[PDB]
Design a protein around this ligand. Structure first.
Ligand SMILES: Nc1ncnc2c1ncn2[C@@H]1O[C@H](COP(=O)(O)OP(=O)(O)NP(=O)(O)O)[C@@H](O)[C@H]1O
Ligand SMILES: Nc1ncnc2c1ncn2[C@@H]1O[C@H](COP(=O)(O)OP(=O)(O)NP(=O)(O)O)[C@@H](O)[C@H]1O
Ligand SMILES: Nc1ncnc2c1ncn2[C@@H]1O[C@H](COP(=O)(O)OP(=O)(O)NP(=O)(O)O)[C@@H](O)[C@H]1O
Ligand SMILES: Nc1ncnc2c1ncn2[C@@H]1O[C@H](COP(=O)(O)OP(=O)(O)NP(=O)(O)O)[C@@H](O)[C@H]1O
Ligand SMILES: Nc1ncnc2c1ncn2[C@@H]1O[C@H](COP(=O)(O)OP(=O)(O)NP(=O)(O)O)[C@@H](O)[C@H]1O
Ligand SMILES: Nc1ncnc2c1ncn2[C@@H]1O[C@H](COP(=O)(O)OP(=O)(O)NP(=O)(O)O)[C@@H](O)[C@H]1O
Ligand SMILES: [Mg+2]
Ligand SMILES: [Mg+2]
Lengths: 310, 310, 310, 310, 310, 310
């Protein structure tokens, strides 16, 4: 527990738990100011527990085989499409933010729904059991921050039915928050940590859409928009890392051919970026154009009554 | 009333009512700047009542069966065509924007007129009584923003007569605003909230046409056009959501085969999108090509002296 | 006068009159940029007089019986054919653009000439005296923009003689502008407002032909053609509305059986559309295939030495 | 001269003369792009001289008696047949295109030859001396674009002899260009303006045949054919108007009873259209079936060693 | 040679010669597409050499005495009948297509044979030596496209013997191609240009019969027949013009009294048309019913063991 | 050893080694306060050993050929791109900080990985053996401070394989420290000196990214940000100098076209600065826009499965 930390006694631990610092990584990655803002915690005590948490979490230089072990803590979520899983190097990655931008109706929201369904199929989580334990991915839950009102429980049921999963179980293990503007959107994202503290193993976070709120609220003001968006994406990236979570976001496009909106801050902050377009009928094509370790490539798949397939 | 909100006393409530914030949802979805622009309301007070309104409206994370309850607040309006109602998954949806684009004379304006008539037939509103009360849909009124001058009261009378409804009652419960340009069009849409505040249960909003004004006003300038159009569609989407209203818009087409005009912003902002074309004689075919939860499909119907039928 | 408007004093009124804004409707339907382009008029002043003009002209939401009153301001011009007047729902409508397309020699130009003659017969203007005053239709004048050189004063004289009207009076009350290309055609149409300002009660505007200039000037470039054509038709529609004028246009046809030329922009912009074809001898058949409120139908008539008859 | 025009100085005038714009009407009817394609002429300067030329040529709205004056600038050429001149309302009209279609051997080419002969008989040009001056029709010359090789100087001599005219004078005042295909045909027509610039008072232009080249070159491709034909007929119509010239064209026929070939574009572009058929022996019958101001009618005449007679 | 042409160097000349363009007139009358279809020749280069060839061949406007010089390049072939030569205005004309239609056994094929024999008698070619040189008509050769199998060398020998000519010389200077269907017939005609390129001075081309193949191959399909026939006759007319050749064709007749078969396209394309019928015994009567410059007239002649005589 | 220094005996040397001052240069460049902060070391003793270390290290005025010898101690690391090595004047320079800024996905992180691989290929270190000994660059190790989580051992393996190097050897000789915020980032950089003291020949230091942590932590506070950033870059520059190390940093960009973020302090502190942008496909372009001795220039290269190439 928190009292394992230097300078931290039962009293200080109570103050930390109340201020939301319940595990070591959050303390190890905190700033002294951040902790001193907690009544009762001094600069000296704050600096001492941060150093102790870094030490207990072994956050130092690593080399050799240890570098491979860190990469092995990443687990991946299947998309239900073999070509898409392949272009992704296996599946959607935990500890990163993956963005699907695309023209209207291309399937961005369908992919988000399919992901909430797939999270409830144990065989769709791919991981190295020696680096990620069965308990770490047990009873996974998803958080869907819907900023457009397009969450559709009947779609969840249909995709689950076709996947052989129970639809009600997916709805029971998915938290949906409807955000009507960028302030709500950002706050819900900041509150995911509270869901985790309440015992929910959040392993998938969806922000659909990442930018439609900001784009119609900040139309001159393009700096304050970029600033707020940057804070939001830092929160997303940090939660993906600290909670070994897959974070997926959708994005719209504008002319100039098309470019995902959101400018440089969204461009730098999204770890993986895709452009999704429609093919003939129910065919879709997802083009990976940014990733840390894979070549750009395209995946053809379909969206049908069953969800994503092929 | 508004004084149920934290920090809000009779004085502040008067200022809110005067500034147009009369119900909790509008306050819960406001920005601090938006409220502080009201003389007498501070940043602190503004932030406090927004949080209180969100709390009173229970705008947090939901899961399980509660996800189904939200979807059940959606009611649908019949189109008078059984095939069209079926392709729509039941009828035109409240809380969303539905767009009918199509070549000249295909029936876009006829569908808008039929919808104003159908709103006055209680049996044509389909809803789950446990989620939507009889009082919520009682004395419904329509708003028709006519940007081309094609509203025709004699057509309203004819369609009503054939539906067994009283024509004068439809005209009495339909507000029509003739907009000669995009500025008027946008302002009328922004003023619908005032009609509601005056006691009119606005449940159907029609924008016919959504784009003919913008397309001939902005011919280079294609960015300022897209910006204004985006603000207008955000206003439409928000009013559909906050007032549990069906919002219908018509759109024109251009070569490239045909594509509805308005580009990406109209494409992303319209929840449902149809392409209407003429068949032989009075036959028409409506092709649904964008929707959140339904497969693309086509509906055949007819437009006759009776209105839409089949 | 213009000083009735908020913010407008004698000085500003002079600037408005000089820039061509002489009546309230034109100001009520102007854009702030449009007015600020007048040296001396600020954005603030511009926005204030537009709002004041809208208010003085009562351009807001209307419902009930008021919806019927707006429709009653429409007056109709007889075509001299009882079957054609019937298919038209009474006659050619003011505040709309009516297009007659047809194969060569079918009578498009004859109908335009007959209309200029009929305008000078008081009994051929059909209107509701409680909505349209005798003074509003008094001393009516026609404008004929001839883009092919087919205006024929001797035909005017012959048709007038057979109608019992004085031929010279028709020529005296008809302004003809010969346009040799689309630029001239468009400019003449834009200058009709100046004729009105000079005291001419323009109540009929004829564009014969609407498209023959554009079709041979833009032969690739089919986008710039559609753009120019759209601006021209917006000017026509707006003048029909603001000046309670009947606007008639003729159009040619091409193979594919036949289709009027001009594509989607002419198709959407023409309120009423007819296809005229020749029958045996002097018999003609006009097929109405687009209108806001009438079923498609055909009218048989004849073109003789007397003009249009039957 | 050209420097009378606003913005045009000696330098610009030289550039205009070199680019072929030598008189005001051609400039008044030019497009800004058309003039800016002249090295040295800017968009601003181009727009300014076009407006100035329109102003100097008084190309605005006209009404009353002025409408009669425009029609009086039309002069007519006798056909040598009293019945044909009568069906034509006086003779072949300047400022228009007149088409004679007919079965083989019906006399199309004979009429073209007779017209070149008649142009050289002063009494065969009918005009209102107060609208058309003796100098305007003095030293008239004809241009005969022969696309079949049927021009026959011996026929010219024979018809001239029988008319009391000198045959050599007709040949001296007739330019013949043999076109072997539609490209040559169109280019010769475009070059008539150069003949005029060289001091030739071209008052009659004959295209015999208008369509035999296009019909065997474009046999699928029926759109490109119609496009080229349309450009050619626009050139013909514009030269008839700008140079107060009679333009005559011949056309072939096909089964379906017979119809002149060339489709809708030739049908709309020819101002007057005749069908010529053979009667018994040297008798011929010309049926007028399209004209702006005359009833359809038939003229009987004969073709003999003397040319057209009766 | 071809390098005299602008843009044409030795390389391009080789490509032209290989593609069959060996003399200037063929290039002057080519289309840009036609030349660009030659690998190595660009649109720009093609347009430039066509203009250069037209210029080198002086294909512009001509007037006065020059019009007589063009007509003087026409030479005529005697028919052996003085009355027939007289009705023809001298003899069969080069640069034109002359058709002899007639009932069975009337002598159509005999006239074709006599013409091949007469071509080998220098005194039977009538020409103006100042316009046509002795070298132009030297070593003339004939091409006989026999579509019925009726070419008879023994008839050639007999007619030659009676004319005082050597029979073998006529056979040596006559190329006969037996066509079993319209495709072969048309191709042989298209290949005459190759014979000329090989050094044969082709001055007479006979198509016997022009229509018997088409009439039994296309029996509904009367449009495709007319199209193919038109292409074939354009090829014939162009070769008559470019190679200053006499082209003769025979045609059959049907009831309706009789009419030559082939419809309007053969009727327009044949420059001269005759109807041949039998008189008593070996007497024949040829009625000229279409020609550019001669009155209709009849010639009586006989067909005997000597060939055509009288 | 340290006792070679004036005033320093075994006891004082122990205190120095414990406080991290193990070699003369660090002492020669220390402040008296810095050393007196070591219990047991007086101001007098501190001043005396600093002067002695400066003397033993010969840190005085130099001129003539000695100026060239100092510059010769700089060694350079190949980038694997010949154009990039050329724009760099040979390769990445030791004793300096080189910054690669660029839009998302441009290859900043790929260049950092390639550099860690290239360090393990002896032939990729370019140096003057008379100024830099084989032992000075022997067993080189890299330190990669990853502030975004984008270090990818599989990429190291792939690039090493394609370079002919052993992948495991690169991972064994590369220390990676994951920093979640600017405090960790700065501390890891300060701790590199300890790695060196432990016997690791650190010759490459990578900070990827230099600014993404600071930019989202300090959003007003732009002074404290600039101060912390300045201290961090001084630490980087000093370690590059004292340990003859190549220091590479990556940077993000913002609109204003683009500018690397970090303001004036990063701009002054980075010795070399590049802007990297994407070309077509895998092509990249690196623009050098700041350096001490080279002209601005651009290098084109590619990023493929092999790493950086061209
Ligand atoms: N139940 C279903 N059966 C078959 N196809 C479906 C179903 N539901 C949705 N679709 C398909 O999914 C498309 C809509 O996909 P969606 O993921 O919502 O697009 P989107 O990219 O998020 N568009 P938006 O947010 O406006 O930009 C539809 O138009 C249908 O083609
Ligand atoms: N009273 C009626 N009786 C029968 N059919 C009618 C009636 N009124 C309208 N229609 C039909 O409706 C068509 C016009 O439909 P409309 O809805 O106005 O087309 P639209 O798509 O809105 N065209 P537009 O806005 O120009 O693009 C007519 O041309 C008639 O076919
Ligand atoms: N004075 C007249 N007396 C009787 N009929 C007339 C008279 N004038 C014109 N017509 C008829 O009107 C026809 C021409 O009608 P018109 O209106 O000019 O056709 P149009 O459709 O405009 N053709 P165009 O513009 O080429 O496509 C003639 O060919 C005559 O049949
Ligand atoms: N010198 C003449 N004397 C008497 N009649 C003549 C003379 N020249 C020509 N004709 C008549 O004119 C007819 C030919 O007329 P022509 O004008 O060439 O017909 P066309 O319609 O142009 N035929 P085409 O172009 O094939 O379709 C002849 O067949 C003679 O009937
Ligand atoms: N050697 C000959 N001596 C005398 N008369 C001959 C001789 N050869 C042919 N004829 C005459 O020529 C007639 C046949 O002429 P011919 O030119 O073949 O007719 P055609 O019009 O071409 N018939 P066809 O092609 O069936 O329609 C015979 O029937 C004989 O009258
Ligand atoms: N294994 C690989 N094979 C081929 N190309 C690759 C591979 N790995 C990465 N890439 C390319 O490298 C790009 C990513 O380069 P990267 O160096 O991470 O960009 P970056 O500038 O650091 N972006 P960021 O930090 O967000 O601003 C990819 O999107 C691929 O184009
Ligand atoms: Mg209108
Ligand atoms: Mg010829």
């Amino acid at each position: 527990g928190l009292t394992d930390l230097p300078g931290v006694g039962p009293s200080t631990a109570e103050k930390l738990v109340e201020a939301g610092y319940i595990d070591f990584m959050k303390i190890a990655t905190a700033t002294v100011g951040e902790l001193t803002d907690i009544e009762g915690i001094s600069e000296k005590a704050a600096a001492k527990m941060i150093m102790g948490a870094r030490d207990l979490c072994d956050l130092g230089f690593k080399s050799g085989i240890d570098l491979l072990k860190q990469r092995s803590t990443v687990w991946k979520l299947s998309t239900s499409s073999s070509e898409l899983d392949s272009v992704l190097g296996g599946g959607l990655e935990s500890q990163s933010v993956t963005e699907f931008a695309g023209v209207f109706g291309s399937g961005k929201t369908q992919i988000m729904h399919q992901s909430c369904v797939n999270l409830q199929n144990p065989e769709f989580l791919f991981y190295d059991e020696e680096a990620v334990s069965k308990g770490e991915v047990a009873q996974p839950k998803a958080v869907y921050i819907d900023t457009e009102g397009t969450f559709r429980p009947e779609r969840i049921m249909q995709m689950a039915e076709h996947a052989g999963i129970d639809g009600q179980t997916v709805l029971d293990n998915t938290f949906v928050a409807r955000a009507y503007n960028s302030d709500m959107q950002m706050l819900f994202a900041e509150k995911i940590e509270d869901l985790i503290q309440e015992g929910n193993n959040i392993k998938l976070v969806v922000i659909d859409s990442l930018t439609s709120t900001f784009r119609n609220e900040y139309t001159g003001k393009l700096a304050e928009r970029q600033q707020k968006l940057g804070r939001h994406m830092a929160t997303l990236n940090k939660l993906a890392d600290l909670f070994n979570c897959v974070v997926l976001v959708t994005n719209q496009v504008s002319a100039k051919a098309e470019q995902a909106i959101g400018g440089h801050i969204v461009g730098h902050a999204a770890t993986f970026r895709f452009f999704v377009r429609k093919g003939k009928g129910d065919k879709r094509v997802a083009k990976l154009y940014k990733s840390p370790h894979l070549p750009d490539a395209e995946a053809i798949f379909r969206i049908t009554e069953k969800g994503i397939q092929d």
